[model samples]
Target chain A: HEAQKAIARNSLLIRSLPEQHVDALLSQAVWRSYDRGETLFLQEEKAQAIHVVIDGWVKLFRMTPTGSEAVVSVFTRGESFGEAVALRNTPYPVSAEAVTPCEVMHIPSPVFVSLMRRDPEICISILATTFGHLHSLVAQLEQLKAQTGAQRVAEFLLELCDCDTGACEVTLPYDKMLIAGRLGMKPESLSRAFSRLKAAGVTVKRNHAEIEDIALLRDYAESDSWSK
Target chain B: MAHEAQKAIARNSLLIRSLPEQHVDALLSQAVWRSYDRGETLFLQEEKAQAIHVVIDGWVKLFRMTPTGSEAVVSVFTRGESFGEAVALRNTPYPVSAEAVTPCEVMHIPSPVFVSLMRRDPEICISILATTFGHLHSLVAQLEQLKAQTGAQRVAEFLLELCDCDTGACEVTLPYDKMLIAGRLGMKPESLSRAFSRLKAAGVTVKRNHAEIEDIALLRDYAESD
Candidate 1:
């Protein structure tokens, strides 16, 4: 079946590929969706399909050995997250839940195997995606080392904005408490940190926020020389 | 090619002869086995080589996505070690710098070609799946522990991990330098030194480059053991 029509509007990774390649991928993949708050899979569950987010957000998270939950990352539309496990042939490390109503394309393991076996181009593309995820994880680990709770909060705001410019405003995609867990901080501490950023000339608002001055925010967030 | 050589495979690795003899032969025929000096880079960050490398002789460490001079040790692979599996399976750039910490030999198989073989052979694909499962499990375990443990507990666990043996000899060789080990453990050098002191005070001995397990049972009591 020609599946490229649906792919054209959905996957960023697939959209970047040539038309014939996209058609080839669609033939192997089936589209699936979940309602809000529905779990696609749980931590420690066996993974059988490589999921690509077609629409909506997926929360990737886990519970500590102490039973406290920590959000690893919040994946948005068009991105691929769970393919790492699929590629590695491992179980899911974290649970994936639809934060809002979501749609995803699931490629069955056997079909995935077939593509990896016969398709040189698809195999390489899969590698690039996984490598990119690994690279991002490494950066997050380093930033976790160098930044404090306050700075990490600031950086998180900037990341959510997906901009370095001052004029941009970002809405909180998840609650403050969830974001705190992802940032490795307490919600109370995060609230106070926002106040500190405001005192330092950044603007804060409910549900949405902005960096009034990008240069100052960058300096403070990154521990730049000027801030020191 | 030492194809007939018998060596104890690493428990964590996935290179089993589950495929037909002809298939293994076809895959092995493309492998180039070569040894590297200490500190030699098997592959640098963003270097576009498509070969999935398997450690045949010694130890190699993986570190990736470093900005400028900063580095972190993601993991290390020992004898019979197989990584770059993702590189072949996904066709992505090598995300990290692979360096030889000990004199090492590795077999390189072009990832595209390897995936082609697996796709053509169901048994081969299943064998790789089993292997990939082990690698993913280890990565998941690392991510899970990162949130729950202190830097010191992590290092203690690491030391004990290095000492791992099938028979539980309670002594495992250190495959990398203390500084790199510190990076792997996600702490500063000073913190690493302090950690060693803390372990020693708790009755663990630190040798020049090796750790002597004074009390394996005691260590296992406090640190997580398999």
Candidate 2:
């Protein structure tokens, strides 16, 4: 019942299923744990199961031939991934690795597909989730095309902030390099972006970022020009 | 079915192609075909999405208008590709406008009809997943290229995609306006032109509307290098 409650809270797909179907589906799920920097799956490996993050963080990335990592997406608590590849019966398009020690629930694709065949709601949920991802990617693409690097970094910090209060403190979720990759900038550029943000009352002390004025930071992030 | 409808069903959309004969018949029975002249706007960004569309012929682009009155081309689709499914399925307003890049024919599958098929068939859901994931992966790659690669490198990669030959000698006509291509590639028009000039050393020569590659491998090398 505790696991079912967690499933109900976290997974939209599982939550959409009928009670008996939810129990049937969860019965087949296996819990797996990974340490920091561990690879849960590699790109191009045959996908056998879909994963839902129960706790902590994971990153999905692709490696270039030159050995640089391109961070495709970062998943924090309660997100589901690998369903697209599992449904298509294709290899994972990008490798998923643990950013910190994390716990995930793995449901075998066969079991998941069987449940989907019985419940149309399950299919609708997956469609909605996939559509959400597509829209998010489109927004990211727009940001890449329209926003400056400093604005992107500023926006990312605003996303990490907990409240709209004048003074707030938030910690960076990951290393600066990964954050840079996620924001589509060089680490050096990220440093420069941070430097530019000081005028808006943001100061980064190691992983903890202190903001003197959240509204000013928000304005900086939303503005097309850095100078008002 | 009308002959044009038959041809449209036979050639358009992998999603429709994966459906069973009965479902396909049901779809074709409800499908509506429409034609547009070049530069025609099919739908605006804020319109309610009533139908999903598939390009039966020619090209279409999805774009958003900025406050500065410039258009940012998000993606382009050619014959046999579907667009607007995400908005249609979610019952949301279209996020970008759709326009005909050339004189084009498209089929509109009403939202309720497509949603019914998705409910009846898991295969339809899977097909939709694959298509959506493909679009997401491409956007991720584009983001990476924007951050990690030079403008010339991105242009080199674009040319190599258009190259048909394995070795020497291939020509690729630009698919859309150079300005639109520049926006899609996340470059300024001037920077794109400069990138083209830089590719001469890599054996690519640009004409008015096409580029001829002397060596596909050389262009590929240019694309793959740092």
Candidate 3:
């Protein structure tokens, strides 16, 4: 495979780097495959490497003492997530598990940091990128603290849609249970919320869900805030 | 009076060296002394920025409302603590409201003076940026815990966190009253009381506006365990 092509098309971190820089990173990168439901890494696991997804999805979640879980977030293809923990020198707070059969490109953090030190421009870009993640987390805090479960689910869907495009036929990137965990709701609540949306004119058909009228959905989502 | 000024200086003067004593004094001069009664709004949501406020006495809760008007306390500032920092740092408008939880005295430092001083001093900028990073990290840790843990676990961890410092001493401040602290922790006032009762039943010591943490191992186990 063409390394530059892979990095440029798939990994957000390396996509902005020059071709030569991308080639330098690709030299040390290792490709690994994971079957669905396999553990990628566990909580408190050593931060040895950062993984860039080439295919499929992973969910970041931690198991409670009772063996229940609180899902943090899900990473899909063409996105980077776990690098934050590695870069910060902290243990992985949550375990990453393959939600679907996945192909990942792993780069050792020492090598990546050394490459960044050698390339100041890349360092600046990575700093800006990390800052962007910080901003996203801040916004997530705002949402979690302020929005209701229904509003949160709506916003999460809208955000996921916006991450791709404003099209009506949008594919949810994870299983309903996983998505519910991401939204901080139970599976049944997630089902009920979706039904409520459907009742409000959202059409959930198979893998491709469509909102017939986005404005109506937005209005419903924002209705509680309505003073009139 | 100059008591608040003296308190602000004594509390944050460690950071004052980045700016000249004269600059600090000038910045201090710009501070408009204002008093707020309990439950009065010092600032409102989405308000345009003019200045950053430093609490000099009593307690103030910083929070934002859901579009439905339910409020969530983002954080709180007590005596010698600061708020309105994101606005001061980024020149953005305040995203939340600042309300007095008790009768309070605050000093407002104008934006131009604050920003100009920061821009002119790299040391100042770096120090403040590092401080902001620390605050951001704490916020992220809270978010991570909330996302992965239950409400009871969160309250447990929060109380233990409140008890310990960098050196692991159980000395710390409540910063806000129980009602506001409950809001900040994403629980109801009643739930907070219930959690406290649960802790007491678990043999955790609860004092007036402070926790003695009689069972350190139990608290640590609760906080660190799943």
Candidate 4:
């Protein structure tokens, strides 16, 4: 309950609701855990509850029309999902699965819907959170339009490896397939990027990447444009 | 006063259509209208938006600073479209700046009044989100297009949006200022020209700023294909 309180106050979705009703929804919430690769929901399934991640990672992905899987987003502890679809009572557009063993708090939609009639600020909370969601998508689009595939790969690796300078080693967090999906790359494209990244001082061995010089890799990642 | 006509035109708005007539009337009772010349500023980037703006006439664009500090066109909205709702709702600095693409008129309902109504009318709250959801829906499509589409296909799709007829052969005039089409499509002018030339294989012909299509369905298939 203490953890839920901290999340409620810090959560963009819950924090914007009437503080008086924060505990109201939490009291009605239930928790569930999923093992790695466990299915949480299928694409187009009824979205009846909003979820807050209590631990581990969950990914929302969709099967593209060409039959390829594309990662829509990944959520971690304290992050929430299902707000938009739940509010509209629409089927979820993406399938959600646990990327790691995960615990999530699911608050039923009807209870939350009734509160909107009682306290309309619940709608405001949804608006603010969806705004954040929209902004994140906008940033993602900007990155896709501007960055080369290798630059995107570098940025992705930078996110996983966070050393200041000099040599650094970090374990790959997910299967290279999922990582490529997350970066909007194909299997072959990912291999090509990794091949190109060698000149930038990255060596991938097994599930680990060794950086010869973190600062140099950072420069390569942030560089405006570079081609062989 | 010919008032009902404009109200129906106002109903052309996605944000406006979601609400009942009476609430739309109620919201409009306190609305204020402003005018801007082409390229005039509505709000600067990083400045907090104070009201929800519904375009009454003409076009507006949302642009943001790129990594090179150059302006990149984000979105261009026209009549019956709305902007400033999400940022106004968030009470945060806008993610992008709004400017008049052409001389235009805008109606703004101050955030304070919008919030008051938002707290009282759940319909307004839902409608407000219709506008926000729309923006998100578009960006998602754009990202998908960026990934799955070729430059020619992207140009073809852009042309399809402007086509009046959905089937059979159709012809449409290209935009007067054709140079910005590339910018909007996230390509250079030369690349855009290259795409235009490639469209011939898809049964589209461009001569004297007019695009004539041999088959609408065929062009659509090409646009949506790999």
Clashing pairs in 3: none
Candidate 3's docking class is incorrect
The lDDT of each candidate is: 0.61, 0.72, 0.61, 0.72
Candidate 3 chain B weakest lDDT stretch, 10 residues: B9-18
The interface root mean square deviation of candidate 1 comes to 6.4
Runs of candidate 3 exceeding 4 Å displacement: A1-35, A42-45, A52-56, A61-73, A77-79, A88-94, A102-107, A115-148, A163-166, A173-175, A205-208, A212-216, A222-228, B1-226
Misplaced by over 4 Å in model 4 are A1-49, A52-56, A59-79, A85-97, A103-122, A125-151, A159-228, B1-58, B61-75, B87-117, B122-145, B148-153, B168-183, B187-226
**Each candidate's iRMS in angstroms?**
6.4, 5.1, 8.3, 5.1
Q: TM-score for each prediction? A: 0.56, 0.56, 0.45, 0.59
Which candidate would rank higher by lDDT, 1 or 2? Answer: 2
Q: So what's the TM-score on candidate 1?
A: 0.56
Q: Provide per-model DockQ scores.
A: 0.12, 0.22, 0.07, 0.25
Which residue pairs show collisions in model 1? A88-B132, A117-B119, A124-B91, A126-B90, A127-B90, A127-B91, A127-B92, A128-B92, B64-B96, B163-B172
Greater DockQ among 1 and 3 belongs to 1
lDDT of 3 by residue, B110-213 (tens): 77777666546444443333333444444555553334444555566766655433333253345446866665566777877777777664346656545656
Order the candidate numbers by DockQ, best to worst: 4, 2, 1, 3
Tens digits of per-residue lDDT for model 2, A37-100: 8999999999998788776668898898899988878765555777668878888889999987
Q: List the residue pairs that clash in candidate 2.
A: none
Better of 2 and 3 by lDDT: 2
True contacts kept of each: 0.07, 0.38, 0.04, 0.35
Off by over 4 Å in 2: A1-34, A38-49, A52-56, A60-74, A77-79, A89-95, A103-111, A128-144, A166-175, A225-228, B1-33, B36-51, B55-104, B109-120, B137-226
